[PDB]
Each structure stands twice: as structure tokens, then as C-alpha cells.
Amino acid sequence: MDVFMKGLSKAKEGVVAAAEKTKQGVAEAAGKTKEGVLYVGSKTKEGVVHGVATVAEKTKEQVTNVGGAVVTGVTAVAQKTVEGAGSIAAATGFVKKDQLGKNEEGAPQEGILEDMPVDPDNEAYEMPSEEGYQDYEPEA
């Protein structure tokens, strides 16, 4: 599924590039405007600061509520996905390969293989890596 991983990354890259482009365009327009300077906000700045402190306390309480909602979504999504996965496997009938009909076999043959068997097993007890080994002597 290397193609799926590549496609997933491609979409992520597009989203990042789009978000960055929009942010840059907005920042430029926000500073390009000279109306804000003429309008003046120094008086509102002090008012905004007091308002922000009040909002901050209100925001903190709301933030906690939002955090809980976010957790619920994560809990609800993970659980339903686990259940849906099981349902899919059940419908599939847990099959390694999808095939129809029976595999006909016949025409017996005999012969030998020039290439000896790989034999993954080393037929050796071998020592455990837990004991380890010494790379230095006590002398020095």
C-alpha cells in the first residue's frame, strides 16, 4: 500500500501549502491597509486589554468544555472504528484469499531439486543474548 501512503502525503502537502498561502495573503492585506492607522485604536487598546482579561477567564472555562468534547469525539471515533472493523471481517468470513470453485489437482510427477533447501533453522542451541559478552579485559 505504498501508493496509498504517497497519496495521503500528497493531500497533506496540498493542505499545508493552501493554509500557508492563505495566511500569507491575509497578513499582507492586514498590514497593507492604512485605514487602521487613520482610524486609531490606542483608546480601544486599553479597553481591549481589560476586555481580554475578562474574556480570558471566560475562555478558560469554555476551553475546558471544548477539551472534553474533543476527547469524547476521539473516544467515540476509536470505538466505532474498532466495532466496524470486526463487522467487516465477519462479513468477509475471515478469508486469506478470495477464490471461487475448487482447485483441481492431478498428473503426479517425481524429481529432485538442484538447489538445496534454505533450512532457516541453524540446528544449534546458540547462547542467549541476555548474558552478553565482554568487549574488554579486567587488566585494562
**49 Ramachandran zone, left/alpha/beta (phi>0; psi -120 to 50):** alpha
DSSP 8-state class, residue 126: -
What are the b/e assignments for 46-61, b being 16+ CB within 10 Å? eeeeeeeeeeeeeeee
C-alpha grid cell for residue 6?
Answer: 504517497
Task: Name the nearest CA neighbour of 67 among 59, 57, 55, 77.
Answer: 59
109-139 as b/e: b if 16+ CB within 10 A: eeeeeeeeeeeeeeeeeeeeeeeeeeeeeee
**Amino acid letter, residue 104:** E
Distance CA 31, CA 37 (A): 10
> Rounded to 5, what percent of the chain is helix, strand, coil?
60, 0, 40
The DSSP code for 77 is: H
The full DSSP string for 64-119 is HHHHHHHHHHHHHHHHHHHHHHHHHHHHHTS-SS---S------------SS----
Q: Cell triple for residue 23?
A: 495566511
Any binding-site annotation on 135? no
Q: How far apart are CA 101 and CA 90, in angstroms?
A: 21
Cell numbers 533450512 correspond to what residue?
119
2 annotated as a binding-site residue: yes
What is the distance between the alpha carbons of residues 83 and 7, in angstroms, rounded to a whole number? 26
**Superfamily of domain 1-105, CATH level 4:** Helix hairpin bin (1.10.287.700)
